[PDB]
Every structure is written in structure tokens, then in C-alpha cells.
Write a protein that binds this ligand. Structure first.
Ligand SMILES: Nc1ncnc2c1ncn2[C@@H]1O[C@H](CSCC[C@H](N)C(=O)O)[C@@H](O)[C@H]1O
Ligand SMILES: Nc1ncnc2c1ncn2[C@@H]1O[C@H](CSCC[C@H](N)C(=O)O)[C@@H](O)[C@H]1O
Ligand code: NA
Ligand code: NA
Lengths: 318, 323
């Protein structure tokens, strides 16, 4: 059962990558620089032989590659060299006590018809409520989300004309990095961000609204953006968000759904689908499923545009 | 389109494969997947009161990682993952340990354990006690761990009996034998011997054919046995702690007596042995060893290496004598 034992012990890959990132030595691996294990251990005060053993495993799983009298990050794993990279922040969330405690309650959550989220069962609060009481975890999560916007922003500005819109609300925009990046290219607009803040953010070019899209969505916007929001929610909660958007919107107003649309048979989509179930009782959805939500909320699909293998844009109207 | 960082993101999210396998095992449904049976997702969901769509979405991911395969009526276990059908399999019990809060929190502190100035295991930094002391105060975690180890013996017993004549011996001590399942399985084939097990017990087990001894192999090993078995013990320990166990064995043994070292050897450059090397570091500041490194421990402890025989790609038996 060599394949089954490889699958069972898959978590050991995530935990050694976490350990590498957490040691704060990634700065020295930048631009594929060849780092000497001995020089690194002496500098940091690390156990040489034990750190060497870690490096050998990181080579075997393809994070590190052997270089002349040392080790370097593989080209595919170069992002780990930057501690503020999406991938560096992602691993901190992935093997967090928040995540693995939530995962432990997944099996229990699947048996219960009107289950609380596996996360709520584990922690006594739903995911976004929990973020209010955990500054460090929220900071890491919000920054991780901001770096996700950085990865698709170039492709986004190409395939959709944002200049046609004058009043733009980022619904669940968090730090508001989407509108920060859009603002860099598109100036002289009204940019607003709706989210839940302990302390409401302040920027010169972006307005921030401390609210709750289950209570109401602000009216007076001709574009409503929902990036990586819908997949956080059950069908009932998703419809309630779209319904609140509908009550806010006049007949000419646009909704942009930005995020994963299930179609390409990718493992990262399937695995993220199960994580959304664990954390939020959310899901990744097929177009027809998103279409069904849209219709029920009183919208129609006007257009679909592919960003990449993971992400598409869905333009809603009415 | 892009696939920017897809390989790194796959490695980062690798733990999701462990946690869905845990969830599948923990649901206790694998019995319906026995003998490569084709399972209808809607029927199983109905029978157990599962949310049909949530359970179908789990099954889809399990197909993608290779645990399940499509059949005409729904899903079957892949031949490769058929062991998950048995809820008492080594693999079923392994995943319970692998994604235990004990392991997760130990892994969190691995980065802090590697600092030269420190001498504590990542496990002790996490839990405030070392691994084996922690077992004493946590019955559920100990039960899963001891059960996991017993099933490891079930996997190798057939091959082990084929490559070593246990019938030649009269008195056999299983040093760190836990539940004593290695001796239970030997006793089924080879009868009339004196079988004893040494380990740390809150309640000393009782069996008709097997004697259980509550002890500490760092203090002393019971004398008067002609075979001492150290199965999956050496890799738990530093060189000095390993030599101390072997020294206590030599002091206990007469000139005629045999030690059998049974365990994992670094031979074929296997990812699983490399990953277990790191796990042994995280839990116990232990390590996996090359054959020459094991020979060196034996020699330093004052033993002759008399025979080496392969069980499989991971496991070997090393026979030690005093002469
Ligand atoms: N009730 C609520 N009202 C407003 N925002 C909410 C909310 N519940 C969750 N959110 C926000 O929804 C966001 C989901 S994560 C996506 C963040 C951002 N749109 C991006 O794509 O990067 C988080 O910022 C979270 O704080
Ligand atoms: N000081 C000590 N004295 C005796 N046994 C000990 C010990 N420290 C650890 N052990 C035991 O060493 C074993 C390691 S796991 C190996 C279990 C068994 N021999 C098998 O192969 O399946 C555990 O059962 C643990 O309880
Ligand atoms: Na769900
Ligand atoms: Na099961």
C-alpha cells in the first residue's frame, strides 16, 4: 500500500513547508541564490544535522534543488523566498490550529442535516465572527486575500472595461486591494469597499464602509463586485446576499461575480470545494448553479469571461 | 490558462488529502467498500442520513486524489486503497494518529525545535510533556497509537516467520512490544514457548500465553531470555538513548542469547522513509538510520552483527549476538 501511505502522510509536505517559511530564512533563498546549509545553521543558531535532514526531504518533495556546495529553492517554489507572497501567507492559514481543528469536525458535520460549519463546531464561532477576536489570524487571511487580487488584476483590466462604471462597490472586498489595484490604472472614479472591520480602514482614493451584506448592501452604485464571496456561503445565504444587492440596485446597475466557476477538472478546485464545506459550509459551483442563484435573486447572466484555469468573471444584470 | 504556482500550491494544500482520508475513515462507511464493491452514493447517503450533495462532493475529491474510482452505480475503493475498507487496518489507524491534534501541534513547533540552543522535542514544546509520558495521561491517543503499532506487526508477521526460525528459541521477550501483538501472532503459529512483553503500562495487560512486564528499558531489561525483540524501537531514539537500550539488553543477556532489531532502514531513497525521519525528529528527536549506522550502534553497545535479512523495501531484521 505504498500509494495509500503516500496519500495518508501527504500532510507532512504541508508541515515541512510551514516549518521552512516559519524559520524566517526564506529571504536568503531569493532569486534562486545558492545557500550553504552550514553557514545558514551557524548564523541562525540551528542544529546543522537536523536542518540538513529537513533540506534532504525538501529536495525529495521538490521544494529545494541541490546547488554547488548548498541548496536553492526550486523555480516552481521560488514564491517561498518572499515571506509576503500569496503562497507564504497561504501555508500559514493551511496548517493553522484554526484549519486542522475545523478539519477534525468535518466527519461529524457531514452526518448532521442542518449542521453548524465544522469550523463553528471546533471553535464555538463561525469563521468570519472568529476573525473579529483573532487579530493575527485575520491579518494573515486578509493579506492572503489581497495577494490573490494581485495575481489576476492584470488579466482582469484587459477582459472587462471598468472605465464604463463611475460608482463601484467592492462587496466583501476586505483590505480593498482589488479597488486599490484598479485605482492605479483607472482614476477619477468613486471606489467604495463593504466589509466587517474592528477598525474601519482609511485611504485617500478608496471609501471603506463597515457593514454586513446580510443586513443591507448600499444603493447608489452602478457596479457591485463580489470577488471570492459566493463560494463562502450555502445556497440560502448566497441568495440572501444577491437579494440584498438586488434591493440596492436600479435597473441599469451591474453585478460582477469574480471567482472559481467549476468546469475544468482540477484538483485545487475539488480540494478548495471541500475546504469551503469545512470552514463555511460553502462550495465551488457550476455555471448553471450560479445561474440558478442569480435567477432566484432576480438577475440574469449577461456574459462570462475566463481569467485563468481557476477564475472566471460572470456579469449579472436586472 | 496561467497555472502560476500550481505545483507549489499542490504541495502547500497536500494536508487536504490527509484530512479528507481521515474524514472518510472516521465516518465508518468503508465497510460498504469491502471486496471492491461498487457503492451507490445516493443509496449510502439515504441509509446514513448524509447530505447527498455534500457527500457526493467528498467522493469526487476522493476520486481525484486516487482513493475512489468510478463504477457503473457510483464509486469503489481503488485496489491501491482497499485497506481503508477494513476500519481496523494499519492504514485506517495510521491516519487517526497522522492528523491527531497531538501531531498537528507538534508540527507547529518543529521550526522552534530546530534552534541549536534548544534541547526539547517539538512535541514537548507543544504539549509540555515528551511523547511517551504524554501517552500515560491520554488514553484515547495511546489506544489509537498502540492499535496502529499492533497492525504494523500483522502486516510483516507472515514474511518475518518465513525469514527467521522463532521455534529454535524457548524464552522470548518483546522489548517495547506495547499490546504484545507481535508475540500474539507468533504464538498462533509457534506454541509452548515462554512469551513476555516489556513496556510502560498504567494497567499491566493479562493474557493466557503471553506474560506482560511493566518496566523501563532505560533502567533495566528482564534477564533470562534467549531472544530479545526490538521492533520499531531504535528509530524513536537518539544515538546515546539507542546505545543505552542496547547496553541494558547486553547486561540482561547471557553469551547464548540473541537480539532481533526489526524496523525501517534507509536503503532505497524512499520519500516515506525521509518523511518518517522528519516525523521521528518532531515527535521524539529520533531518526531513521542507514544499515552501517545501525551496525555502528550495535558495535558501540558491544554486540556482533550476525545476520541482516530484508522483510521488504522499508523493513529489515538485524540479528545481534554477544559472541
Ligand atoms: N456579513 C458580511 N458582510 C460583509 N463582508 C463580509 C461578511 N461576511 C464576510 N465578509 C467578507 O467577505 C470576504 C470574503 S474573502 C474575499 C475577499 C476579497 N473579495 C478578495 O477577493 O480578495 C472577507 O473579506 C470577509 O470579511
Ligand atoms: N522507557 C521505555 N521502556 C519500555 N518501553 C518503552 C519505553 N519508552 C517507550 N516504550 C515503548 O516503545 C514502543 C515504541 S512503538 C513500537 C511498538 C511495537 N514494538 C511494534 O513494533 O509494533 C511503545 O510501545 C512504547 O510504549
Ligand atoms: Na457545503
Ligand atoms: Na469510512
Amino acid at each position: 500500500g505504498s500509494m495509500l501511505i503516500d496519500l495518508i502522510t501527504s500532510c507532512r509536505k504541508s508541515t515541512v513547508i510551514y516549518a521552512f517559511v516559519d524559520m524566517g530564512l526564506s529571504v536568503h533563498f531569493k532569486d534562486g541564490a545558492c545557500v550553504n546549509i552550514s553557514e545558514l545553521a551557524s548564523q541562525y543558531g540551528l542544529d546543522h544535522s537536523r536542518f540538513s535532514r529537513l533540506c534532504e526531504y525538501l529536495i525529495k518533495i521538490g521544494v529545494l534543488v541541490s546547488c554547488n556546495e548548498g541548496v536553492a529553492l526550486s523555480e516552481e517554489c521560488s514564491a517561498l523566498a518572499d515571506p509576503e507572497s500569496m503562497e507564504s501567507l497561504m501555508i500559514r492559514c493551511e496548517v493553522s490550529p484554526e484549519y486542522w481543528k475545523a478539519w477534525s469536525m468535518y466527519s461529524k458535520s457531514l452526518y448532521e442535516n442542518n449542521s453548524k460549519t465544522a469550523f463553528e463546531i471546533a471553535h464555538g464561532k463561525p469563521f468570519f465572527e472568529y476573525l473579529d477576536h483573532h487579530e493575527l489570524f485575520r491579518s494573515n487571511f486578509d493579506s492572503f486575500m489581497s495577494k490573490n487580487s494581485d495575481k489576476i488584476i492584470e488579466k482582469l483590466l484587459d477582459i472587462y472595461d471598468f472605465s464604463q462604471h463611475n460608482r463601484i462597490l467592492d462587496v466583501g472586498g476586505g483590505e480593498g486591494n482589488l479597488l486599490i489595484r484598479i485605482n492605479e490604472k483607472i482614476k477619477g472614479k468613486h471606489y467604495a469597499v463593504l466589509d466587517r472591520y474592528n477598525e474601519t480602514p482609511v485611504l485617500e482614493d478608496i471609501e471603506f464602509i463597515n457593514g454586513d451584506f446580510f443586513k443591507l448592501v448600499p444603493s447608489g452604485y452602478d457596479l457591485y463586485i463580489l470577488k471570492n464571496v459566493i463560494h463562502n456561503w450555502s445556497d440560502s445565504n448566497a441568495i440572501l446576499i444577491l437579494e440584498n444587492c438586488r434591493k440596492a440596485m436600479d435597473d441599469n446597475a451591474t453585478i460582477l461575480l469574480i471567482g472559481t466557476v467549476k468546469k475544468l477538472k482540477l484538483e485545487i478546485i475539488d480540494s478548495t470545494d471541500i475546504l469551503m464545506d469545512v470552514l463555511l459550509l460553502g462550495k465551488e459551483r457550476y455555471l448553471n448553479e450560479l445561474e440558478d442563484l442569480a435567477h432566484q435573486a432576480g438577475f440574469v447572466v449577461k456574459d462570462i469571461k475566463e481569467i485563468n484555469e481557476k477564475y472566471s468573471i460572470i456579469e449579472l444584470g436586472v
